[PDB]
Design an enzyme around this catalytic site. Structure first.
Site, PDB file in Angstrom:
ATOM      1  CB  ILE B  11       4.464 -13.016  -9.586  1.00  0.00           C
ATOM      2  CG1 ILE B  11       5.421 -12.200 -10.459  1.00  0.00           C
ATOM      3  CG2 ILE B  11       3.153 -12.296  -9.313  1.00  0.00           C
ATOM      4  CD1 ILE B  11       6.205 -13.036 -11.460  1.00  0.00           C
ATOM      5  N   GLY B  12       5.761 -11.868  -6.533  1.00  0.00           N
ATOM      6  CA  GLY B  12       6.645 -10.959  -5.825  1.00  0.00           C
ATOM      7  C   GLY B  12       5.956 -10.230  -4.688  1.00  0.00           C
ATOM      8  CB  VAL B  13       6.162  -9.330  -1.464  1.00  0.00           C
ATOM      9  CG1 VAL B  13       5.231 -10.533  -1.475  1.00  0.00           C
ATOM     10  CG2 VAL B  13       7.567  -9.737  -1.045  1.00  0.00           C
ATOM     11  CE1 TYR B  16       2.142   1.659  -5.190  1.00  0.00           C
ATOM     12  CE2 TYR B  16       3.514   0.775  -6.936  1.00  0.00           C
ATOM     13  CZ  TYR B  16       2.996   1.853  -6.248  1.00  0.00           C
ATOM     14  OH  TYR B  16       3.331   3.131  -6.618  1.00  0.00           O
ATOM     15  N   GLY B  17       2.602  -4.374  -2.290  1.00  0.00           N
ATOM     16  CA  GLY B  17       2.166  -5.542  -1.554  1.00  0.00           C
ATOM     17  C   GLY B  17       2.486  -6.845  -2.255  1.00  0.00           C
ATOM     18  CB  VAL B  19       2.246  -9.112  -7.369  1.00  0.00           C
ATOM     19  CG1 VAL B  19       1.684  -9.294  -8.771  1.00  0.00           C
ATOM     20  CG2 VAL B  19       2.470  -7.637  -7.049  1.00  0.00           C
ATOM     21  CE  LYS B  34       0.970  -5.155  -9.751  1.00  0.00           C
ATOM     22  NZ  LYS B  34       2.368  -5.267  -9.253  1.00  0.00           N
ATOM     23  CG  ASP B 136       8.266   2.221  -6.775  1.00  0.00           C
ATOM     24  OD1 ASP B 136       9.453   2.528  -6.524  1.00  0.00           O
ATOM     25  OD2 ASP B 136       7.642   1.326  -6.158  1.00  0.00           O
TER      26      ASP B 136
END
Lengths: 246, 287
Positions: B11-13, B16-17, B19, B34, B136
């Site tokens: 779903i994304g990067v 926090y790394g 996901v 995560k 964030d």
């Protein structure tokens, strides 16, 4: 206000941290009530000797009971569990926590820091890291804040109630009764006894069971039943205090 | 891996790394994993981490609408220097970006913006009242499934991630960082409100109001807009620079209207103290 708002949340958060009333029947094969009694007792003596936060022992007993509700445990593995629950509870509640080595020393080196640290990961995982459950000490303070009573009076109520709370944590009741109710019963037993010895002084005592069971959102008959169970326990503590001979 | 959940997509990067999106089998629902590398010691799990997480887990009990839930946590790997922990969050389909991108609104609306902020601020007044800071706050952090719901995500994870973001930093997007975090590292609660202004404005543009890079880059880029501050309103890491002035609003807006411009200013005050609270904001003339 915010009291209720957070109160409702904490009362819910509590339902998520509830141990099973039947884990001795349905989940444990080796571990019996008498053994939880022994471990609880040892856990309390460690918390006393180490001058831990009052809430470490009751909180570690919540963890223990919650773990026993979900995992079968070898009775030879029980003291390790309890030591691990103190470890976790301490880290959660204390400026300066119990050390792994200190706990091990308290088992006469029956366990080693490495066993303890493995058990921490197990414990914390079983409970899904839901470790910040509100404490009987938490509720007691809340109740006290709603009460007209000089500070010196609250200080005496606090002392006695915490004795009752710790007393409960050693007994089978701590399992079925939620901290909010164990706290309520302890306060009622305290305020009620204090006012009996000192009429005209501790007068939040009147119908306090009704008052607190509203705050707690519980059946008042359950609370009274609870408080009556607490007071029986304190009497059953005539046995342990004396028969320390033969 | 491993976890009773079965990942199904990426779903994304972000910071926090990576996901992922898994399904909860015995629950038949979606999840948003995560992961975090946490320092292992001779005392085991790091206290503030285990504490931080635990307060996240208990925060679900509040059932606030405008914030995602931490539904489960699991330590999957143990070394002797590091422990790995997967965070199981509540899954929400599209982020605020994907929602501002897929906008067949060329130039609107303003009630979808006032109510969208009203939620934003609510969930933020919620976290702040529980002494949680996001720090964030991005458009990728702000979610919303079909319903126009807005779940704030990835709040209160900075300390849990401290260790990791230091072994191997990554990425960035300082476009939202407050002027204190840049100058210093104030970590306080008013940093979220600065990020909230940026987002307020970027809403009726369509991209970063403060799209910089260097921490000083981001700064002057900010001073361009808010104008350089005369002391003593300065803190302690330069150092002095292009002497700027308070540009009006709205040479970076409209569409913005009367109060809407005056509020975005309160949110974009350099002085963390004179800055507006989510609460006093969440009830300004404009909302």
């Amino acid at each position: 206000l915010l009291n209720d708002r957070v109160l409702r949340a904490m009362l819910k958060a509590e339902e998520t941290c509830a141990p099973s009333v039947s884990y001795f029947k349905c989940v444990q094969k080796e571990v019996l009530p008498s053994m939880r009694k022994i471990v609880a007792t040892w856990m309390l003596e460690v918390c006393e000797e180490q001058k831990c936060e009052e809430e470490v022992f009751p909180l570690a007993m919540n963890y223990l009971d919650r773990f026993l509700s979900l995992e079968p445990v070898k009775k030879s593995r029980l003291q390790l569990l309890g030591a691990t629950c103190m470890f976790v509870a301490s880290k959660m509640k204390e400026t300066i926590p119990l050390t792994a080595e200190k706990l091990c020393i308290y088992t006469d080196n029956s366990i080693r820091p490495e066993e303890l640290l493995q058990m921490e990961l197990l414990l914390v995982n079983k409970l899904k890291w839901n470790l910040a459950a509100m404490t009987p000490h938490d509720f007691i303070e809340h109740f006290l804040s709603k009460m007209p009573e000089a500070e010196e009076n609250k200080q005496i109520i606090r002392k006695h109630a915490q004795t009752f709370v710790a007393l409960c944590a050693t007994d089978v009741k701590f399992i079925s009764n939620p901290p909010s109710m164990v706290a309520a019963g302890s306060v009622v037993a305290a305020v009620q006894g204090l006012n009996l010895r000192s009429p005209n002084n501790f007068l939040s005592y009147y119908r306090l069971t009704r008052f607190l069971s509203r705050v707690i959102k519980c059946d008042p008959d359950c609370l009274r039943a609870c408080q009556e169970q607490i007071e029986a326990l304190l009497e059953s503590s005539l046995r342990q205090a004396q028969q320390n001979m033969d | 891996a491993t976890s009773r959940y079965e990942p199904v997509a990426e779903i994304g990067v972000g910071a926090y790394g990576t996901v992922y999106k898994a399904r909860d089998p015995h629950s038949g629902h979606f999840v948003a994993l995560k992961s975090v590398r946490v320092p292992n010691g001779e005392e085991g799990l790091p206290i503030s981490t285990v504490r931080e997480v635990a307060l996240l887990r208990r925060l679900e009990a509040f059932e606030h609408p405008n914030v995602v839930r931490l539904m489960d946590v699991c330590a999957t790997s143990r070394t002797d220097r590091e422990i790995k922990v997967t965070l199981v969050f509540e899954h929400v389909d599209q982020d605020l970006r994907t929602y501002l991108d897929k906008a067949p609104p060329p130039g609107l609306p303003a009630e979808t913006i006032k109510d969208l902020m009203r939620q934003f601020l609510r969930g933020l007044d919620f976290l702040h009242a529980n002494c949680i800071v996001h720090r964030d706050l991005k458009p990728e952090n702000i979610l919303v499934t079909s319903g126009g719901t807005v779940k704030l995500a990835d709040f209160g994870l900075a300390r849990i991630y401290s260790y990791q973001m230091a072994l191997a930093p990554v990425v960035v997007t300082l476009w939202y960082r407050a002027p204190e975090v840049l100058l210093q590292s104030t970590y306080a609660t008013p940093v979220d409100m600065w990020s909230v202004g940026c987002i307020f404005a970027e809403m009726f543009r369509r991209k970063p109001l403060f799209c910089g890079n260097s921490e000083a880059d981001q700064l002057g880029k900010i001073f361009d807009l808010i104008g350089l501050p005369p002391e003593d309103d300065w803190p302690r890491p330069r150092g002095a620079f292009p002497p700027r002035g308070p540009r009006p609003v709205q040479s970076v807006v409209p569409e913005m209207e009367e109060s809407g411009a005056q509020l975005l200013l309160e949110m974009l005050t350099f002085n963390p103290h004179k800055r507006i609270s989510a609460f006093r904001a969440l009830q300004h003339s404009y909302l």
